[PDB]
Design a protein around this nucleic acid. Sequence first.
RNA 1: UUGUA
RNA 2: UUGUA
Lengths: 92, 93, 203, 205
Amino acid sequence: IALYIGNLTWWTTDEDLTEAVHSLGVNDILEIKFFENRANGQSKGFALVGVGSEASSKKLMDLLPKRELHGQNPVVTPVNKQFLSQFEMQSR
Amino acid sequence: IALYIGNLTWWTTDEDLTEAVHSLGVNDILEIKFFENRANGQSKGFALVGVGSEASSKKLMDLLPKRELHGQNPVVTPVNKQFLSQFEMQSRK
Amino acid sequence: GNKYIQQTKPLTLERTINLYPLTNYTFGTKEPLYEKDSSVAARFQRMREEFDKIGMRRTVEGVLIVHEHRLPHVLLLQLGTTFFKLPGGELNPGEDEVEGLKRLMTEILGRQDDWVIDDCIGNWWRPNFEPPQYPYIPAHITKPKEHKKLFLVQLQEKALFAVPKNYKLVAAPLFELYDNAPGYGPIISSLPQLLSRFNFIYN
Amino acid sequence: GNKYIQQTKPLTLERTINLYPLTNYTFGTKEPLYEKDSSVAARFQRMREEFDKIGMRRTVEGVLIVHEHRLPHVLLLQLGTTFFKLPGGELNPGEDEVEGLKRLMTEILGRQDLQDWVIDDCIGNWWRPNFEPPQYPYIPAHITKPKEHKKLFLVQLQEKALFAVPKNYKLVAAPLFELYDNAPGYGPIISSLPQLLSRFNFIYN
RNA sequence: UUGUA
RNA sequence: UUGUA
């Protein structure tokens, strides 16, 4: 079970993100992996998240995007090669 | 009125190079412009060099080889884009 | 149980430096400063010339760092949207390096209304009257034209910076410079690595 | 008139360092030292595992400098034909950084017959944000738990000393212009050493 | 993407 | 070949 989170600052961190979901109250995070410029390791502004529950996935899908991380709305979509492209189009 | 000078080590300063020249009777040096990799700045083994006197040129040609700068015999040659093509091919060593 | 007291570490082994939020620092405009040299072939002409009577040109630059989002930022000077230089300049013959820098800095970033510098971070030498600069003197070169020397300028908790009209004072985050010589020159872009050794604090 | 003695400077402001000819140093062999991991994917796996029991990897490397023709050369270990590393390795948990490099250097170049290393300069820090090759001289904003941290220490040599080398490793003296803007050749770290050493004031004995 | 002995 | 408001 996995997702895509995006539209967050390049200083939005795995740690202080987990706090966000912990606020919705999930705690399911298995692992998170940010996408970033290899050139300088700078975050692109979106991460592939890993989760273990399905009901929470709903909550994330459902509710997260109506919250502010650093002034941003977590554009959460599921893992798909056609979503991804918009997330990097974002970079540009 | 210039020559090329090669078979030089990459550690042949401009100073020691000139040390040898005055030691041939030639006291009218010009430029002594070294060729060198632009990426790392390493000497390219050779250096353009001009001269006011134009017979001292012969001097170098004849006398500089059979002299040893850092245990290597120089190679005084006239200037030429074929020598260029020559030295350059050597740099890949 | 009882802990023993941590021994002191030589500054050469762990240099601890204090950083502050970029927002503690602000600029005001000032009388614009042009450059001793104007066109490109100028500086070199002057260089060649100067060297002949002055000898080698000694240059210094100061590396004022600020911090935001746990990321050291370097204060650079821009004009056209493509040129960024460190604060600093040429020394006057015989001038002390550090005092020297202080002078040029205040000269270029004043407080009509101070500078702390205890670290040398780099060195680059200009082997000929050409563009190329290298962080070392190649073996065939015995007398190099210019000698740049870079220092870490510690900053006060906060301050004001007068800024010649013609300059915008930007604050590059490290990753912006990293591997980015085509953007910021070989000196500037290697500031991240040059800075990595410092144990920074983000106040 | 009589010469005035330029006093020593604050070390932070000027570091003078002594370099001796490569000749001063003699190098014999020793039973080969195959690495702990093997394949590329092999060592990352090990990393993942370990990070979970111990945590972030702590690596230390020593930069031994000699010189030739008034030009500093860094001793680089070399496996095979195109891989170089700096003598160094993984610290054991809790280990004092320096003590650990000493243990490692000795492990990796020790003379059969109790030598001593001089390490009092950290010259760089590199971080691996995730579990792949990417390493940067700084910790990115988003990263809160780096996977591996590498600390670099200039290692001073004495006027002369003897070393031993694994029969598998070859030992080369890389001159700086050989490494500079040569990331493809030697990687980022090693290839930026010329920069990271430029700050030192070297003496060629 | 300095990585396979 | 970070350069010309």
